[PDB]
C-alpha cells in the first residue's frame, strides 16, 4: 500500500499544478497566436 | 552565388488560396442577389452570361 | 426592355468567349508578373 499512496500522493500534488498547466496552455496559445499574426519564422527545432 | 536564394525557399508556411465556386440558377431566380448577400452586399448586377464577384473570408485565428 | 442579342448573335458565342479569352490573358500576366514581383516580401520573414 505504500507504493499505492505515494502514488496517490503524487497525483494530489499534480492537482494542485493542473490549475497552473491548463492556463499555461491557454496564455501559451494566446502567445503562439500572436507570434503567427506576427509572422515570425518558426525554427525547425519548434515543437508545435 | 545563389544561398541568399536558397535560404529564401524554407518560408515557414502558407495559407489556402485559390479557391473557386460555381453555380446555376435560372433566369432572374435571385441568384445574383443571394450571391451578392453572402458577401453582404444588397445586390450586384442581374446581367447576361457567366457573372464574378467576390467572397470575403476572414479568419479571426489566422488574422 | 430586350435582353435576347446573345442569342441573336450572328457569329456565336466566339466573340464573347474571345473577350472572356483576352480578360483572362490579361489578368493572368498580370498576376505572373505580381508573383514574381511579390517574391520579394519573403525576405523579412527571414531574421538575421
Partial sequence: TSDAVTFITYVQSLKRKIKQFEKQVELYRNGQRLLEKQRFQFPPSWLY | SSILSEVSTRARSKLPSGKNILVFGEDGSGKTTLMTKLQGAEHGKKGRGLEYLYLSVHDEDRD | ?48
Fill in chain 3, 1 to 48: 426592355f430586350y435582353r435576347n442579342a446573345l442569342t441573336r448573335m450572328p457569329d456565336g458565342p466566339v466573340a464573347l468567349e474571345e473577350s472572356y479569352s483576352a480578360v483572362m490573358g490579361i489578368v493572368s500576366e498580370v498576376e505572373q508578373y505580381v508573383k514574381v514581383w511579390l517574391q520579394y516580401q519573403c525576405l523579412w520573414d527571414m531574421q538575421a
